[PDB]
Amino acid sequence: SSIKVLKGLDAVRKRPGMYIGDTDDGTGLHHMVFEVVDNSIDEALAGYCSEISITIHTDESITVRDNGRGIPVDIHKEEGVSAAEVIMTVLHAGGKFDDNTYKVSGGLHGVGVSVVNALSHELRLTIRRHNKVWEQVYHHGVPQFPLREVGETDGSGTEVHFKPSPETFSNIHFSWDILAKRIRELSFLNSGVGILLRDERTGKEELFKYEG
Ligand SMILES: CO[C@@H]1[C@@H](OC(N)=O)[C@@H](O)[C@H](Oc2ccc3c(O)c(NC(=O)c4ccc(O)c(CC=C(C)C)c4)c(=O)oc3c2C)OC1(C)C
């Protein structure tokens, strides 16, 4: 089972353009952010998330944080690992790739966040759920340790800090303009959700919240 999962992540790293799009022209790089944000938006659509933040760090890493339920943490009998680890490591975890419905939400969201994990040289997942803080670190999608309880919290939600792999992507430089344009659109499409974009490289920040 563990070998099968590692092979799946290796397949993403072998042919990244088939999962994320062009790895040189910035389209795949920005898709990495948009896939993580789309998971937070799904939590807003479900009725649990009102706040999403996207932070661009000085090392061109990204943090996406939401105040949703937090990815479930309970250990599966079958995989022997947290539900969260399965979500972060298995393409379309728990289900099929929907060849009928990918045209609406995109193929990338159809395979899911495990692609972002596979194509990140490092990813830190922090979950706030049931008053506990859980963390898991990955490298190229491979967990460093099982999801572990690291603290207590009054908050809930999911935080993903990822560093795109320079083995996958050339010209790893995020565009404020590309991110802001899409975030403004997501705000318009998702009334009441506050989407905060912060660029620590420049000190630029902008809250997008549509009240229509
Ligand atoms: C990347 O994870 C995404 C989530 O992303 C974010 N940012 O929250 C979100 O888009 C959505 O999150 C869901 C989707 C479904 C449930 C959901 O059905 C829940 N209900 C439960 O009672 C529950 C409790 C334990 C448990 O193991 C599961 C199934 C586990 C799943 C679906 C990962 C569900 C729940 O607590 O949280 C859920 C959450 C947080 O789907 C994921 C997990 C693929």
Numbering used by the authors: 10 to 221
What does the published report state?
Whereas fluoroquinolones, which target both gyrase and topo IV, are widely used in the clinic, inhibitors interfering with ATP binding to GyrB/ParE subunits have not found significant clinical application, despite intensive research efforts during the last 70 years since the discovery of novobiocin, the first ATP-competitive GyrB inhibitor.
Bacterial DNA gyrase and DNA topoisomerase IV (topo IV), both type II topoisomerases, responsible for the ATP-driven introduction of negative supercoils into DNA and ATP-driven supercoil relaxation and decatenation, respectively, are validated antibacterial targets. Gyrase is a heterotetramer of GyrA and GyrB subunits (A2B2), while topo IV is a heterotetramer of ParC and ParE subunits (C2E2). We have developed compounds with a promising activity against Acinetobacter baumannii and Pseudomonas aeruginosa, which are both on the WHO priority list of antibiotic-resistant bacteria. Cocrystal structures of 1 in complex with Escherichia coli GyrB24 and (S)-27 in complex with A. baumannii GyrB23 and P. aeruginosa GyrB24 revealed their binding to the ATP-binding pocket of the GyrB subunit.
